[PDB]
PDB file of N, CA, C and O in Angstrom:
ATOM      1  N   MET A   1      88.293  87.671 132.997  1.00 34.90           N
ATOM      2  CA  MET A   1      87.508  87.780 134.236  1.00 34.90           C
ATOM      3  C   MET A   1      86.096  87.870 134.234  1.00 34.90           C
ATOM      4  O   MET A   1      85.347  87.020 133.394  1.00 34.90           O
ATOM      5  N   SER A   2      85.505  88.948 134.781  1.00 34.23           N
ATOM      6  CA  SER A   2      83.992  89.070 134.693  1.00 34.23           C
ATOM      7  C   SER A   2      83.490  90.713 134.496  1.00 34.23           C
ATOM      8  O   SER A   2      84.112  91.565 135.500  1.00 34.23           O
ATOM      9  N   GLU A   3      82.560  91.016 133.820  1.00 32.41           N
ATOM     10  CA  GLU A   3      81.932  92.268 133.889  1.00 32.41           C
ATOM     11  C   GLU A   3      80.289  92.241 133.378  1.00 32.41           C
ATOM     12  O   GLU A   3      79.648  91.452 133.737  1.00 32.41           O
ATOM     13  N   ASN A   4      79.968  93.218 132.625  1.00 33.01           N
ATOM     14  CA  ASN A   4      78.654  93.378 132.052  1.00 33.01           C
ATOM     15  C   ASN A   4      78.710  92.990 130.560  1.00 33.01           C
ATOM     16  O   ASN A   4      77.860  93.413 129.645  1.00 33.01           O
ATOM     17  N   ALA A   5      79.784  92.176 130.390  1.00 29.13           N
ATOM     18  CA  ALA A   5      79.969  91.580 129.174  1.00 29.13           C
ATOM     19  C   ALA A   5      79.170  90.047 129.202  1.00 29.13           C
ATOM     20  O   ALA A   5      78.651  89.868 130.499  1.00 29.13           O
ATOM     21  N   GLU A   6      79.206  89.198 128.464  1.00 29.02           N
ATOM     22  CA  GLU A   6      78.607  88.043 128.529  1.00 29.02           C
ATOM     23  C   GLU A   6      79.313  86.973 129.491  1.00 29.02           C
ATOM     24  O   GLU A   6      80.580  87.087 129.535  1.00 29.02           O
ATOM     25  N   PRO A   7      78.606  86.327 130.488  1.00 30.56           N
ATOM     26  CA  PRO A   7      79.035  85.511 131.208  1.00 30.56           C
ATOM     27  C   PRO A   7      79.730  84.149 130.533  1.00 30.56           C
ATOM     28  O   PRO A   7      79.108  83.662 129.693  1.00 30.56           O
ATOM     29  N   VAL A   8      80.903  83.795 130.886  1.00 30.07           N
ATOM     30  CA  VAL A   8      81.579  82.650 130.266  1.00 30.07           C
ATOM     31  C   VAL A   8      82.188  81.488 131.240  1.00 30.07           C
ATOM     32  O   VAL A   8      82.778  81.971 132.336  1.00 30.07           O
ATOM     33  N   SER A   9      81.973  80.307 131.000  1.00 26.66           N
ATOM     34  CA  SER A   9      82.316  79.335 131.909  1.00 26.66           C
ATOM     35  C   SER A   9      83.408  78.535 131.138  1.00 26.66           C
ATOM     36  O   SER A   9      83.375  78.172 130.176  1.00 26.66           O
ATOM     37  N   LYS A  10      84.576  78.215 131.987  1.00 24.89           N
ATOM     38  CA  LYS A  10      85.631  77.412 131.488  1.00 24.89           C
ATOM     39  C   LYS A  10      85.399  76.129 132.122  1.00 24.89           C
ATOM     40  O   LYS A  10      85.115  76.050 133.261  1.00 24.89           O
ATOM     41  N   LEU A  11      85.504  75.025 131.292  1.00 21.96           N
ATOM     42  CA  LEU A  11      85.489  73.772 131.721  1.00 21.96           C
ATOM     43  C   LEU A  11      86.648  72.917 131.660  1.00 21.96           C
ATOM     44  O   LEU A  11      86.994  72.817 130.496  1.00 21.96           O
ATOM     45  N   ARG A  12      87.183  72.184 132.531  1.00 22.37           N
ATOM     46  CA  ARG A  12      88.068  71.057 132.434  1.00 22.37           C
ATOM     47  C   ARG A  12      87.419  69.920 132.592  1.00 22.37           C
ATOM     48  O   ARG A  12      86.835  69.590 133.592  1.00 22.37           O
ATOM     49  N   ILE A  13      87.530  69.015 131.563  1.00 21.18           N
ATOM     50  CA  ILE A  13      86.866  67.675 131.634  1.00 21.18           C
ATOM     51  C   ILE A  13      87.966  66.789 131.365  1.00 21.18           C
ATOM     52  O   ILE A  13      88.694  66.664 130.403  1.00 21.18           O
ATOM     53  N   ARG A  14      87.984  65.692 132.306  1.00 23.86           N
ATOM     54  CA  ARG A  14      89.077  64.663 132.287  1.00 23.86           C
ATOM     55  C   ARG A  14      88.598  63.480 131.706  1.00 23.86           C
ATOM     56  O   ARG A  14      87.440  62.770 132.119  1.00 23.86           O
ATOM     57  N   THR A  15      89.148  62.859 130.618  1.00 22.80           N
ATOM     58  CA  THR A  15      88.737  61.672 129.907  1.00 22.80           C
ATOM     59  C   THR A  15      89.261  60.596 130.821  1.00 22.80           C
ATOM     60  O   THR A  15      90.231  60.790 131.586  1.00 22.80           O
ATOM     61  N   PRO A  16      88.680  59.445 130.802  1.00 24.32           N
ATOM     62  CA  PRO A  16      89.135  58.210 131.318  1.00 24.32           C
ATOM     63  C   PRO A  16      90.582  58.089 131.210  1.00 24.32           C
ATOM     64  O   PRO A  16      91.387  57.843 132.174  1.00 24.32           O
ATOM     65  N   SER A  17      91.053  58.119 129.913  1.00 24.84           N
ATOM     66  CA  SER A  17      92.385  57.895 129.560  1.00 24.84           C
ATOM     67  C   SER A  17      93.377  58.902 130.403  1.00 24.84           C
ATOM     68  O   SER A  17      94.547  58.893 130.396  1.00 24.84           O
ATOM     69  N   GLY A  18      92.718  59.923 131.051  1.00 24.15           N
ATOM     70  CA  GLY A  18      93.551  60.895 131.800  1.00 24.15           C
ATOM     71  C   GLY A  18      93.804  62.224 131.166  1.00 24.15           C
ATOM     72  O   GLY A  18      94.424  63.185 131.792  1.00 24.15           O
ATOM     73  N   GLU A  19      93.334  62.366 129.840  1.00 24.27           N
ATOM     74  CA  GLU A  19      93.643  63.557 129.163  1.00 24.27           C
ATOM     75  C   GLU A  19      92.614  64.552 129.741  1.00 24.27           C
ATOM     76  O   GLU A  19      91.584  64.257 130.313  1.00 24.27           O
ATOM     77  N   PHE A  20      92.820  65.921 129.293  1.00 26.20           N
ATOM     78  CA  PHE A  20      91.852  66.785 129.653  1.00 26.20           C
ATOM     79  C   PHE A  20      91.373  67.620 128.647  1.00 26.20           C
ATOM     80  O   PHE A  20      92.034  68.083 127.672  1.00 26.20           O
ATOM     81  N   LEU A  21      89.911  67.650 128.425  1.00 26.75           N
ATOM     82  CA  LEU A  21      89.273  68.477 127.513  1.00 26.75           C
ATOM     83  C   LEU A  21      89.154  69.897 128.215  1.00 26.75           C
ATOM     84  O   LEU A  21      88.755  69.833 129.479  1.00 26.75           O
ATOM     85  N   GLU A  22      89.313  70.888 127.491  1.00 26.56           N
ATOM     86  CA  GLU A  22      89.208  72.157 128.115  1.00 26.56           C
ATOM     87  C   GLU A  22      88.541  73.169 127.079  1.00 26.56           C
ATOM     88  O   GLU A  22      88.895  73.089 125.984  1.00 26.56           O
ATOM     89  N   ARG A  23      87.519  73.900 127.650  1.00 28.85           N
ATOM     90  CA  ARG A  23      86.541  74.392 126.578  1.00 28.85           C
ATOM     91  C   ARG A  23      85.640  75.486 127.435  1.00 28.85           C
ATOM     92  O   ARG A  23      85.312  75.232 128.393  1.00 28.85           O
ATOM     93  N   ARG A  24      85.665  76.674 126.606  1.00 29.80           N
ATOM     94  CA  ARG A  24      84.836  77.777 127.239  1.00 29.80           C
ATOM     95  C   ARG A  24      83.350  77.901 126.618  1.00 29.80           C
ATOM     96  O   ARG A  24      83.313  77.782 125.498  1.00 29.80           O
ATOM     97  N   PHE A  25      82.534  78.163 127.452  1.00 30.42           N
ATOM     98  CA  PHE A  25      81.047  78.174 127.019  1.00 30.42           C
ATOM     99  C   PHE A  25      80.274  79.398 127.402  1.00 30.42           C
ATOM    100  O   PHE A  25      80.727  80.057 128.463  1.00 30.42           O
ATOM    101  N   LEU A  26      79.231  79.641 126.767  1.00 29.60           N
ATOM    102  CA  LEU A  26      78.331  80.719 127.274  1.00 29.60           C
ATOM    103  C   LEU A  26      77.570  80.263 128.383  1.00 29.60           C
ATOM    104  O   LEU A  26      76.606  79.468 128.188  1.00 29.60           O
ATOM    105  N   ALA A  27      77.598  80.871 129.494  1.00 25.48           N
ATOM    106  CA  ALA A  27      76.964  80.370 130.873  1.00 25.48           C
ATOM    107  C   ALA A  27      75.450  80.438 130.714  1.00 25.48           C
ATOM    108  O   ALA A  27      74.727  79.717 131.263  1.00 25.48           O
ATOM    109  N   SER A  28      74.886  81.417 129.877  1.00 26.82           N
ATOM    110  CA  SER A  28      73.546  81.589 129.654  1.00 26.82           C
ATOM    111  C   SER A  28      72.878  80.718 128.560  1.00 26.82           C
ATOM    112  O   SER A  28      71.697  80.457 128.520  1.00 26.82           O
ATOM    113  N   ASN A  29      73.674  79.862 127.967  1.00 27.20           N
ATOM    114  CA  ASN A  29      73.397  78.787 126.991  1.00 27.20           C
ATOM    115  C   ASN A  29      73.101  77.482 127.641  1.00 27.20           C
ATOM    116  O   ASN A  29      73.400  77.095 128.637  1.00 27.20           O
ATOM    117  N   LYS A  30      72.454  76.512 126.584  1.00 30.00           N
ATOM    118  CA  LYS A  30      71.858  75.413 127.125  1.00 30.00           C
ATOM    119  C   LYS A  30      72.917  74.299 127.478  1.00 30.00           C
ATOM    120  O   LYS A  30      74.141  74.407 126.831  1.00 30.00           O
ATOM    121  N   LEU A  31      72.880  73.662 128.556  1.00 27.92           N
ATOM    122  CA  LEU A  31      73.976  72.640 128.917  1.00 27.92           C
ATOM    123  C   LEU A  31      74.213  71.633 127.741  1.00 27.92           C
ATOM    124  O   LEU A  31      75.394  71.209 127.822  1.00 27.92           O
ATOM    125  N   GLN A  32      73.286  71.434 127.062  1.00 28.24           N
ATOM    126  CA  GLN A  32      73.385  70.499 125.823  1.00 28.24           C
ATOM    127  C   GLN A  32      74.806  70.785 125.153  1.00 28.24           C
ATOM    128  O   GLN A  32      75.264  69.830 124.493  1.00 28.24           O
ATOM    129  N   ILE A  33      75.053  72.084 125.136  1.00 28.27           N
ATOM    130  CA  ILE A  33      76.413  72.432 124.335  1.00 28.27           C
ATOM    131  C   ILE A  33      77.482  71.646 124.823  1.00 28.27           C
ATOM    132  O   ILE A  33      78.475  71.253 123.994  1.00 28.27           O
ATOM    133  N   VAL A  34      77.453  71.354 126.211  1.00 31.09           N
ATOM    134  CA  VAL A  34      78.666  70.626 126.852  1.00 31.09           C
ATOM    135  C   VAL A  34      78.366  69.172 126.352  1.00 31.09           C
ATOM    136  O   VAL A  34      79.412  68.660 125.865  1.00 31.09           O
ATOM    137  N   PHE A  35      77.259  68.565 126.521  1.00 30.63           N
ATOM    138  CA  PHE A  35      77.043  67.137 126.138  1.00 30.63           C
ATOM    139  C   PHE A  35      77.453  66.987 124.668  1.00 30.63           C
ATOM    140  O   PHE A  35      77.932  66.107 124.335  1.00 30.63           O
ATOM    141  N   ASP A  36      77.114  67.889 123.818  1.00 32.13           N
ATOM    142  CA  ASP A  36      77.584  67.878 122.266  1.00 32.13           C
ATOM    143  C   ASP A  36      79.090  67.950 122.243  1.00 32.13           C
ATOM    144  O   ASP A  36      79.501  67.227 121.391  1.00 32.13           O
ATOM    145  N   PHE A  37      79.698  68.843 123.138  1.00 31.70           N
ATOM    146  CA  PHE A  37      81.204  68.751 123.146  1.00 31.70           C
ATOM    147  C   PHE A  37      81.632  67.498 123.482  1.00 31.70           C
ATOM    148  O   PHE A  37      82.538  67.032 122.861  1.00 31.70           O
ATOM    149  N   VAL A  38      81.460  67.041 124.601  1.00 34.34           N
ATOM    150  CA  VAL A  38      82.170  65.629 125.107  1.00 34.34           C
ATOM    151  C   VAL A  38      81.810  64.681 123.879  1.00 34.34           C
ATOM    152  O   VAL A  38      82.768  64.006 123.517  1.00 34.34           O
ATOM    153  N   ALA A  39      80.579  64.604 123.320  1.00 37.39           N
ATOM    154  CA  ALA A  39      80.228  63.600 122.495  1.00 37.39           C
ATOM    155  C   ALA A  39      80.914  63.594 121.246  1.00 37.39           C
ATOM    156  O   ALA A  39      81.486  62.754 120.770  1.00 37.39           O
ATOM    157  N   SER A  40      81.249  65.064 120.874  1.00 40.08           N
ATOM    158  CA  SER A  40      81.972  65.234 119.569  1.00 40.08           C
ATOM    159  C   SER A  40      83.584  64.812 119.855  1.00 40.08           C
ATOM    160  O   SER A  40      84.170  64.613 118.914  1.00 40.08           O
ATOM    161  N   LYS A  41      83.901  64.546 121.109  1.00 42.86           N
ATOM    162  CA  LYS A  41      85.229  64.047 121.424  1.00 42.86           C
ATOM    163  C   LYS A  41      85.444  62.521 121.520  1.00 42.86           C
ATOM    164  O   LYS A  41      86.520  62.042 121.736  1.00 42.86           O
ATOM    165  N   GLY A  42      84.199  62.061 121.611  1.00 45.53           N
ATOM    166  CA  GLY A  42      84.276  60.570 121.499  1.00 45.53           C
ATOM    167  C   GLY A  42      83.499  59.909 122.743  1.00 45.53           C
ATOM    168  O   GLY A  42      83.476  58.819 123.033  1.00 45.53           O
ATOM    169  N   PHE A  43      83.255  60.859 123.536  1.00 47.19           N
ATOM    170  CA  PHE A  43      82.249  60.446 124.799  1.00 47.19           C
ATOM    171  C   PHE A  43      80.898  60.713 124.778  1.00 47.19           C
ATOM    172  O   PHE A  43      80.471  61.624 125.701  1.00 47.19           O
ATOM    173  N   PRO A  44      80.096  60.092 123.895  1.00 45.70           N
ATOM    174  CA  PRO A  44      78.706  60.293 123.805  1.00 45.70           C
ATOM    175  C   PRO A  44      77.994  60.170 125.181  1.00 45.70           C
ATOM    176  O   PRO A  44      78.408  59.150 125.882  1.00 45.70           O
ATOM    177  N   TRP A  45      76.973  60.959 125.532  1.00 47.27           N
ATOM    178  CA  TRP A  45      76.363  60.955 126.982  1.00 47.27           C
ATOM    179  C   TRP A  45      75.594  59.605 127.235  1.00 47.27           C
ATOM    180  O   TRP A  45      75.208  59.248 128.273  1.00 47.27           O
ATOM    181  N   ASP A  46      75.578  58.735 126.161  1.00 46.28           N
ATOM    182  CA  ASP A  46      74.786  57.502 126.502  1.00 46.28           C
ATOM    183  C   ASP A  46      75.889  56.455 126.868  1.00 46.28           C
ATOM    184  O   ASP A  46      75.456  55.631 127.670  1.00 46.28           O
ATOM    185  N   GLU A  47      77.241  56.429 126.244  1.00 43.10           N
ATOM    186  CA  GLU A  47      78.212  55.743 126.841  1.00 43.10           C
ATOM    187  C   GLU A  47      78.727  56.093 128.230  1.00 43.10           C
ATOM    188  O   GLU A  47      79.005  55.252 129.018  1.00 43.10           O
ATOM    189  N   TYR A  48      79.148  57.354 128.185  1.00 41.30           N
ATOM    190  CA  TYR A  48      79.904  57.629 129.399  1.00 41.30           C
ATOM    191  C   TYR A  48      78.921  58.719 130.327  1.00 41.30           C
ATOM    192  O   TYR A  48      77.967  59.279 129.904  1.00 41.30           O
ATOM    193  N   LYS A  49      79.337  58.694 131.718  1.00 42.02           N
ATOM    194  CA  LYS A  49      78.747  59.611 132.517  1.00 42.02           C
ATOM    195  C   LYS A  49      79.791  60.863 132.917  1.00 42.02           C
ATOM    196  O   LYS A  49      80.909  60.588 133.003  1.00 42.02           O
ATOM    197  N   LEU A  50      79.059  62.072 132.991  1.00 40.67           N
ATOM    198  CA  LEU A  50      79.929  62.966 133.202  1.00 40.67           C
ATOM    199  C   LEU A  50      79.817  63.685 134.665  1.00 40.67           C
ATOM    200  O   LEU A  50      78.787  64.299 134.964  1.00 40.67           O
ATOM    201  N   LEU A  51      80.927  63.593 135.407  1.00 39.15           N
ATOM    202  CA  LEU A  51      80.776  63.716 136.800  1.00 39.15           C
ATOM    203  C   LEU A  51      81.562  64.971 137.151  1.00 39.15           C
ATOM    204  O   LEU A  51      82.402  65.364 136.749  1.00 39.15           O
ATOM    205  N   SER A  52      80.707  65.591 138.449  1.00 42.19           N
ATOM    206  CA  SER A  52      81.346  66.684 138.888  1.00 42.19           C
ATOM    207  C   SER A  52      81.634  66.385 140.421  1.00 42.19           C
ATOM    208  O   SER A  52      80.591  65.937 141.110  1.00 42.19           O
ATOM    209  N   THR A  53      82.707  66.721 140.950  1.00 40.85           N
ATOM    210  CA  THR A  53      82.914  66.889 142.361  1.00 40.85           C
ATOM    211  C   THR A  53      82.455  68.362 142.641  1.00 40.85           C
ATOM    212  O   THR A  53      81.980  68.903 141.641  1.00 40.85           O
ATOM    213  N   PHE A  54      82.735  68.875 143.939  1.00 42.20           N
ATOM    214  CA  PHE A  54      82.030  69.894 144.340  1.00 42.20           C
ATOM    215  C   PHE A  54      81.156  69.175 145.296  1.00 42.20           C
ATOM    216  O   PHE A  54      81.665  68.444 146.201  1.00 42.20           O
ATOM    217  N   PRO A  55      79.875  69.115 145.365  1.00 42.41           N
ATOM    218  CA  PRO A  55      79.134  68.113 145.686  1.00 42.41           C
ATOM    219  C   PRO A  55      79.202  67.038 144.426  1.00 42.41           C
ATOM    220  O   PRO A  55      79.384  67.585 143.233  1.00 42.41           O
ATOM    221  N   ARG A  56      79.297  65.811 144.481  1.00 42.47           N
ATOM    222  CA  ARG A  56      79.624  64.857 143.408  1.00 42.47           C
ATOM    223  C   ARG A  56      78.405  64.543 142.750  1.00 42.47           C
ATOM    224  O   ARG A  56      77.730  63.527 143.263  1.00 42.47           O
ATOM    225  N   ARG A  57      78.023  65.063 141.602  1.00 42.74           N
ATOM    226  CA  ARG A  57      76.793  64.831 140.806  1.00 42.74           C
ATOM    227  C   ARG A  57      77.049  64.372 139.596  1.00 42.74           C
ATOM    228  O   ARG A  57      78.041  64.616 138.924  1.00 42.74           O
ATOM    229  N   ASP A  58      76.050  63.667 138.813  1.00 44.26           N
ATOM    230  CA  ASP A  58      76.188  63.257 137.363  1.00 44.26           C
ATOM    231  C   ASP A  58      75.467  64.192 136.546  1.00 44.26           C
ATOM    232  O   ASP A  58      74.320  64.228 136.457  1.00 44.26           O
ATOM    233  N   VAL A  59      76.266  65.036 135.894  1.00 43.50           N
ATOM    234  CA  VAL A  59      75.825  66.186 135.091  1.00 43.50           C
ATOM    235  C   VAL A  59      74.857  65.613 133.853  1.00 43.50           C
ATOM    236  O   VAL A  59      74.030  66.402 133.448  1.00 43.50           O
ATOM    237  N   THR A  60      75.221  64.639 133.301  1.00 39.37           N
ATOM    238  CA  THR A  60      74.418  63.897 132.215  1.00 39.37           C
ATOM    239  C   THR A  60      72.927  63.730 132.483  1.00 39.37           C
ATOM    240  O   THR A  60      72.109  63.620 131.673  1.00 39.37           O
ATOM    241  N   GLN A  61      72.883  63.716 133.891  1.00 40.38           N
ATOM    242  CA  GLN A  61      71.464  63.434 134.289  1.00 40.38           C
ATOM    243  C   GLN A  61      70.648  64.666 134.402  1.00 40.38           C
ATOM    244  O   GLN A  61      69.363  64.672 134.641  1.00 40.38           O
ATOM    245  N   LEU A  62      71.227  65.835 134.225  1.00 41.67           N
ATOM    246  CA  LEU A  62      70.492  67.131 134.226  1.00 41.67           C
ATOM    247  C   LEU A  62      69.882  67.395 132.857  1.00 41.67           C
ATOM    248  O   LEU A  62      69.959  66.659 131.942  1.00 41.67           O
ATOM    249  N   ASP A  63      69.005  68.573 132.957  1.00 43.51           N
ATOM    250  CA  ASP A  63      68.132  68.957 131.654  1.00 43.51           C
ATOM    251  C   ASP A  63      69.029  69.877 130.858  1.00 43.51           C
ATOM    252  O   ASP A  63      69.245  70.999 131.276  1.00 43.51           O
ATOM    253  N   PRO A  64      69.191  69.339 129.622  1.00 40.73           N
ATOM    254  CA  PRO A  64      70.238  69.923 128.716  1.00 40.73           C
ATOM    255  C   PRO A  64      69.614  71.282 128.263  1.00 40.73           C
ATOM    256  O   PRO A  64      70.373  72.030 127.667  1.00 40.73           O
ATOM    257  N   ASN A  65      68.355  71.470 128.545  1.00 42.32           N
ATOM    258  CA  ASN A  65      67.643  72.745 128.144  1.00 42.32           C
ATOM    259  C   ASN A  65      68.016  73.827 129.206  1.00 42.32           C
ATOM    260  O   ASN A  65      67.380  74.947 129.036  1.00 42.32           O
ATOM    261  N   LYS A  66      68.554  73.471 130.322  1.00 47.20           N
ATOM    262  CA  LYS A  66      69.070  74.392 131.251  1.00 47.20           C
ATOM    263  C   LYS A  66      70.236  75.065 130.863  1.00 47.20           C
ATOM    264  O   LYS A  66      71.067  74.474 130.134  1.00 47.20           O
ATOM    265  N   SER A  67      70.454  76.467 131.452  1.00 47.43           N
ATOM    266  CA  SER A  67      71.894  77.099 131.180  1.00 47.43           C
ATOM    267  C   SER A  67      72.831  76.594 132.227  1.00 47.43           C
ATOM    268  O   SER A  67      72.591  75.835 133.093  1.00 47.43           O
ATOM    269  N   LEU A  68      74.019  76.810 131.926  1.00 51.37           N
ATOM    270  CA  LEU A  68      75.115  76.467 132.625  1.00 51.37           C
ATOM    271  C   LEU A  68      75.043  76.977 134.105  1.00 51.37           C
ATOM    272  O   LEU A  68      75.288  76.441 135.256  1.00 51.37           O
ATOM    273  N   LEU A  69      74.705  78.345 134.044  1.00 53.61           N
ATOM    274  CA  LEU A  69      74.378  79.097 135.270  1.00 53.61           C
ATOM    275  C   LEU A  69      73.514  78.406 136.139  1.00 53.61           C
ATOM    276  O   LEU A  69      73.659  78.270 137.335  1.00 53.61           O
ATOM    277  N   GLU A  70      72.405  77.908 135.525  1.00 52.51           N
ATOM    278  CA  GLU A  70      71.205  77.208 136.311  1.00 52.51           C
ATOM    279  C   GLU A  70      71.748  76.020 136.854  1.00 52.51           C
ATOM    280  O   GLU A  70      71.676  75.822 138.009  1.00 52.51           O
ATOM    281  N   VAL A  71      72.459  75.055 136.033  1.00 53.03           N
ATOM    282  CA  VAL A  71      72.856  73.796 136.612  1.00 53.03           C
ATOM    283  C   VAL A  71      74.274  74.058 137.449  1.00 53.03           C
ATOM    284  O   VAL A  71      74.987  73.030 137.718  1.00 53.03           O
ATOM    285  N   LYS A  72      74.668  75.255 137.593  1.00 52.45           N
ATOM    286  CA  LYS A  72      75.750  75.503 138.539  1.00 52.45           C
ATOM    287  C   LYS A  72      77.147  75.036 138.002  1.00 52.45           C
ATOM    288  O   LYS A  72      77.944  74.677 138.693  1.00 52.45           O
ATOM    289  N   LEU A  73      77.385  75.528 136.677  1.00 55.20           N
ATOM    290  CA  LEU A  73      78.545  75.342 136.113  1.00 55.20           C
ATOM    291  C   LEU A  73      79.182  76.554 135.549  1.00 55.20           C
ATOM    292  O   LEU A  73      79.305  76.798 134.225  1.00 55.20           O
ATOM    293  N   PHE A  74      79.585  77.508 136.645  1.00 56.12           N
ATOM    294  CA  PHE A  74      80.139  78.737 136.197  1.00 56.12           C
ATOM    295  C   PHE A  74      80.927  79.289 137.481  1.00 56.12           C
ATOM    296  O   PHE A  74      80.276  79.190 138.560  1.00 56.12           O
ATOM    297  N   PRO A  75      82.073  79.894 137.345  1.00 56.84           N
ATOM    298  CA  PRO A  75      82.725  80.049 136.153  1.00 56.84           C
ATOM    299  C   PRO A  75      83.885  79.042 135.646  1.00 56.84           C
ATOM    300  O   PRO A  75      84.053  78.774 134.506  1.00 56.84           O
ATOM    301  N   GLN A  76      84.369  78.353 136.668  1.00 55.77           N
ATOM    302  CA  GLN A  76      85.227  77.167 136.233  1.00 55.77           C
ATOM    303  C   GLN A  76      85.057  76.130 137.037  1.00 55.77           C
ATOM    304  O   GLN A  76      84.414  76.080 138.270  1.00 55.77           O
ATOM    305  N   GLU A  77      85.106  74.963 136.412  1.00 59.79           N
ATOM    306  CA  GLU A  77      84.649  73.604 136.982  1.00 59.79           C
ATOM    307  C   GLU A  77      85.249  72.402 136.299  1.00 59.79           C
ATOM    308  O   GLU A  77      85.411  72.314 134.995  1.00 59.79           O
ATOM    309  N   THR A  78      85.848  71.592 136.975  1.00 55.11           N
ATOM    310  CA  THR A  78      86.463  70.409 136.337  1.00 55.11           C
ATOM    311  C   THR A  78      85.351  69.144 136.371  1.00 55.11           C
ATOM    312  O   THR A  78      84.746  68.899 137.364  1.00 55.11           O
ATOM    313  N   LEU A  79      85.165  68.513 135.449  1.00 55.66           N
ATOM    314  CA  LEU A  79      84.324  67.256 135.305  1.00 55.66           C
ATOM    315  C   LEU A  79      85.002  66.102 134.905  1.00 55.66           C
ATOM    316  O   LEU A  79      86.227  66.245 134.499  1.00 55.66           O
ATOM    317  N   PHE A  80      84.587  65.048 135.128  1.00 57.19           N
ATOM    318  CA  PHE A  80      85.238  63.667 135.031  1.00 57.19           C
ATOM    319  C   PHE A  80      84.395  62.747 134.140  1.00 57.19           C
ATOM    320  O   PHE A  80      83.307  62.610 134.599  1.00 57.19           O
ATOM    321  N   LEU A  81      84.891  62.160 133.197  1.00 57.97           N
ATOM    322  CA  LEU A  81      84.274  61.141 132.381  1.00 57.97           C
ATOM    323  C   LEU A  81      84.466  59.879 133.065  1.00 57.97           C
ATOM    324  O   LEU A  81      85.538  59.483 133.681  1.00 57.97           O
ATOM    325  N   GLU A  82      83.344  59.014 132.931  1.00 56.37           N
ATOM    326  CA  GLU A  82      83.330  57.568 133.476  1.00 56.37           C
ATOM    327  C   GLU A  82      82.239  56.849 132.765  1.00 56.37           C
ATOM    328  O   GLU A  82      81.025  56.951 132.686  1.00 56.37           O
ATOM    329  N   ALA A  83      82.778  55.698 132.355  1.00 60.09           N
ATOM    330  CA  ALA A  83      82.140  54.759 131.504  1.00 60.09           C
ATOM    331  C   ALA A  83      80.970  54.193 132.333  1.00 60.09           C
ATOM    332  O   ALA A  83      81.017  54.212 133.644  1.00 60.09           O
ATOM    333  N   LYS A  84      79.841  53.886 131.653  1.00 59.28           N
ATOM    334  CA  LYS A  84      78.729  53.368 132.399  1.00 59.28           C
ATOM    335  C   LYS A  84      78.642  51.772 132.245  1.00 59.28           C
ATOM    336  O   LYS A  84      79.060  51.162 131.347  1.00 59.28           O
TER     337      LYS A  84
END
């Protein structure tokens, strides 16, 4: 849940193949960590685009030096991989 502990974001990311990556992050940390994570799964940010509904935006387009809190990825959010 939530307290005066560290904020943490749970992310569900759906690969094109339809599988889901699921992974929890420090919400105060850089978005890059997410980019690193998908990349490490085979979906480098140059090959694929990382999409969010909510409003539908392409997360890979954001500044990886921003926190998840800043880019509005907290506390749970599903993202969608999509080749370019």
